[PDB]
Design a protein around this ligand. Structure first.
Ligand SMILES: O=C(O)C[C@H](NC(=O)OCc1ccccc1)C(=O)O
Ligand SMILES: COC(=O)[C@@H](N)Cc1ccccc1
Ligand SMILES: COC(=O)[C@@H](N)Cc1ccccc1
Ligand SMILES: [Ca+2]
Ligand SMILES: [Ca+2]
Ligand SMILES: [Ca+2]
Ligand SMILES: [Ca+2]
Ligand SMILES: [Zn+2]
Length: 316
């Protein structure tokens, strides 16, 4: 839309009030002109045709139940943009301020979210397994991070490269969650998962085994399901990332934590300089070691801790 930049107010999926950047031209649109070439949020109207209709509102107030997933998709896309710009000097997912597009109300009872190669897409959930998936900042940032990966390393979504692709999205989804600094944790999707059950999530970085995912290469899934275990074997890398940041002793191997900012710097550099579409876990270890060496020096604690973390998860 060509219009005037405005600021609306609304409530997200969890009932929290927030301001959102909109555009006025007859209607108020979920179009944020303040970030790159724009952030745009669409109504899929319970169908599967994408993107749907650019979100229009008569009064710039977004307090209806129907509005909530749109408010959060829009707002959290903005936060994620700010993370990548302010923390990594990256302008949108392509590094050149590409427009960021999201659609909400995708399909009916849809317990998923995704990046379709061009935009983010969020189901509303069935109300049992999930509530609308844009309610989770880690979910939103997970999805935008797929776009970042696709434009950078281009990790093929199968087997080990695919599990790295997934872990990169969990890692940066979590780092974005810490950036926004509202109830941050090392768990994935907790804000929108199982409204009837307290304290659970879909995946855990701190203890992947909590939800059945491997936390050691010896436990890797070797079958055909889930594109060769991309959401399963991600646990191995997620655990390594958690260890690098927070430290711990895992399977008898002790890791000195170097904190989340350095974790993000190391992995952002590995992703954008060293990984390739076919990188496997061993190559991820090498990429991370090289990135830490570039940033902190070969004799550094940071490099030492990256090595210990990959040792701890059995990745040589
Ligand atoms: O099925 C797919 O490939 C899309 C998958 N989506 C997915 O699992 O939807 C829910 C969710 C997303 C991120 C964090 C927690 C929950 C993905 O993005 O990897
Ligand atoms: C068979 O997969 C399952 O039952 C899933 N709930 C994963 C899981 C496995 C083991 C422990 C906890 C969770
Ligand atoms: C339902 O998917 C899950 O629970 C995931 N934790 C993947 C998984 C499935 C089965 C066994 C182990 C891991
Ligand atoms: Ca309204
Ligand atoms: Ca949280
Ligand atoms: Ca989380
Ligand atoms: Ca829950
Ligand atoms: Zn993913």
């Amino acid at each position: 839309i060509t219009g005037t930049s405005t600021v609306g107010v609304g409530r997200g999926v969890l009932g929290d009030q927030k301001n959102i950047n909109t555009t006025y031209s007859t209607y108020y649109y979920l179009q944020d002109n303040t970030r790159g070439n724009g952030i745009f949020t669409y109504d899929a109207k319970y169908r599967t045709t994408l993107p749907g209709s650019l979100w229009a509102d008569a009064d710039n107030q977004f307090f209806a139940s129907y509005d909530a997933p749109a408010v959060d998709a829009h707002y959290y896309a903005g936060v994620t943009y700010d993370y990548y710009k302010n923390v990594h000097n990256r302008l949108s997912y392509d590094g050149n301020n590409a427009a960021i597009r999201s659609s909400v109300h995708y399909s009916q009872g849809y317990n998923n979210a995704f990046w379709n190669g061009s935009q983010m897409v969020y189901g509303d959930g069935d109300g049992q397994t999930f509530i609308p998936l844009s309610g989770g900042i880690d979910v939103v940032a997970h999805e935008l991070t797929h776009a970042v990966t696709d434009y950078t390393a281009g990790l093929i979504y199968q087997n080990e490269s695919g599990a790295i692709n997934e872990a990169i999205s969990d890692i940066f989804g979590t780092l974005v969650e810490f950036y926004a600094n509202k109830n941050p944790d090392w768990e994935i999707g907790e804000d929108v998962y199982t409204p009837g059950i307290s304290g659970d999530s879909l995946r855990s970085m701190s203890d992947p085994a909590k939800y059945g995912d491997p936390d050691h290469y010896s436990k890797r899934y070797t079958g055909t399901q889930d594109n060769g275990g991309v959401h399963i074997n991600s646990g191995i890398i997620n655990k390594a990332a958690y260890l690098i940041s927070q430290g711990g002793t895992h399977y008898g191997v002790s890791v000195v934590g170097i904190g989340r900012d350095k974790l993000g710097k190391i992995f952002y550099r590995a992703l954008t300089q060293y990984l390739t579409p076919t990188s496997n876990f061993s190559q991820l270890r090498a990429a991370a070691v090289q990135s830490a060496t570039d940033l902190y020096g070969s004799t550094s604690q940071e490099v030492a801790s990256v090595k210990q973390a990959f040792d701890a998860v059995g990745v040589k």
